[PDB]
Amino acid sequence: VYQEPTDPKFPQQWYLSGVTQRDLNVKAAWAQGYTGHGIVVSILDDGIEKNHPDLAGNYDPGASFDVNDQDPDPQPRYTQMNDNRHGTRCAGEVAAVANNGVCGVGVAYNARIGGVRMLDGEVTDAVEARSLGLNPNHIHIYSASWGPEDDGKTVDGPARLAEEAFFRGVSQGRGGLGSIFVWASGNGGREHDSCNCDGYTNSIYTLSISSATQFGNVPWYSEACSSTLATTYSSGNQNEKQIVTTDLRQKCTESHTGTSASAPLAAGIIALTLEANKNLTWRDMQHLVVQTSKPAHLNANDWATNGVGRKVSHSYGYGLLDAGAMVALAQNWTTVAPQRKCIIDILTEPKDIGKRLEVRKTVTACLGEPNHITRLEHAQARLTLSYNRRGDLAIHLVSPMGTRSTLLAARPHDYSADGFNDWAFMTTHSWDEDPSGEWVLEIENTSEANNYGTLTKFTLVLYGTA
């Protein structure tokens, strides 16, 4: 009985609905009656053309602000090069108006869309915090298609205020259910960057999203890491189609690309999911993604089955998001139990790394205590170590159930001698596994060079329930 969009460009939005069973299954969600009505999404970027003909109808001033110039109007700054078109492109993917004879449609075409202009100027910790913490009781989902430079040699993440914003967000946002923070995993594929060296994507508070090309391949710009949760389609080679969305100066583009285009699609799907169940907590949402994402059709060299029978890849997380499945499961979802946190400091003495180091430890996961965990969610391996050439290292963490998460792959451009200072490598690959038993940390020098260093701290942090 449902009638799909009549927008001129909808037919080119192959990732929304296609006759090749290779899409995000969004129409199936629309058919179930979910379009994002009542949900508020904010694009933290370089601004949003609120008067765009395909955005005006859904624009929401309450979900917007201009942090760069300190005013409530997020309108982009116009320049000959059209530098500030990025946010507007991301906004359209989420909530471009449907059936209005203009361009295409957003995943959640009935959602309210806002924008925080915060990338067009000096991006400080304060700027980030004010953006991430904007109207936490009005805005439901925040979408961020930006982050530290992807040079493949830096390790960076949120400073204190931003961290506090994230924490206040998942704790108090949405009336206590927790703000949903969607993040683009990065464009450093060519520089061999790792998204675990990015504190925004690596955070447990954000749903880090990767990309897949139309033919189901890992895009050239893709960054692999264990912190990524799932994937949505984006651009690839010139024979593959790209993302169709709203563009600056009230135009329509068919060439929105890279990691930037994936997060917004995920944000939209999540918007449909919240409409299906407004009581989902920020953790419930991550559970739904893990459970409903599909690996099938996606090509990767590292698909592996984890302790609970789910396929995972460092390039895709649990696979392609499935809107229809997300909204279906949301309806019968029982809120998960309170989050427990079990801290296990492993080292009793510094360990020399040399060519290879292996650290084994049998844990009880806080058995007999209030934070006993039998069903894992995120896991972090907080490491502190020194090394002469950081990029030559590769670090892996194996769960008692045999799931091997690569916390860090070699980064050839990383010649840093500063090592890692209590860096919290995170993995989503052992989600739902029982964490008790022997864990193994492996650190290896992937180069033939005679490198040296010392691992001074290894704290295993488990989040989950019983």
Annotated binding residue 102: yes
- Please count the residues of this chain forming the interface with Na ion, following the rule CB under 5 A: 3
Is residue 279 annotated as involved in ligand binding? no
Give the interface segment with Ca ion, choosing from 143-151, 252-260, 278-286, 287-295 (CB under 5 A): 143-151
* Active site (annotated) includes residue 86: yes
Interface of this chain with Ca ion, residues 190 to 219, rule: CB under 5 A: 193, 198
From the list Na ion, Ca ion, none, partner contacted by residue 54 (C-beta under 5 to 8 A by kind): Ca ion
Among 42, 179, 196, 206, binds Na ion (CB under 5 A): 206
Residue appearing with tokens 């298609």? 145
Indicate which residue of 45, 247, 284, 322 is catalytic: 45
**In this chain, which of 92, 173, 188, 236 binds Ca ion, going by CB under 5 A?**
188
Shortest Å, Cβ 244 to Ca ion: 10
210 binds Na ion (CB under 5 A): no
- Select which of 52, 86, 287, 314 is catalytic: 86
The residue number with the shortest CB distance to Na ion is 206
**Is position 399 annotated in a ligand binding site?**
no
46 binds, among Ca ion, Na ion, none (CB under 5 to 8 A by kind): none
370 marked as binding residue: no
Q: Taking CB under 5 A as the criterion, which residues in 52-81 touch Ca ion?
A: 54, 66, 69, 71, 73
Which of 179, 203, 260, 293 is catalytic? The answer is: 260
Q: Binding site for substrate: residue ranges?
A: 46, 83-84, 128, 145-150, 156, 184-187, 198, 200, 260
Residue ranges binding Na ion (CB under 5 A): 203, 206, 208
Q: Binding site for Ca(2+): residue ranges?
A: 7, 54, 66, 71, 73, 97, 100, 102, 104, 150, 193, 223
Active centre residues (catalytic): 45, 86, 260
Residue ranges binding Ca ion (CB under 5 A): 7, 54, 66, 69, 71, 73, 97, 100, 102-103, 150, 186, 188, 193, 198
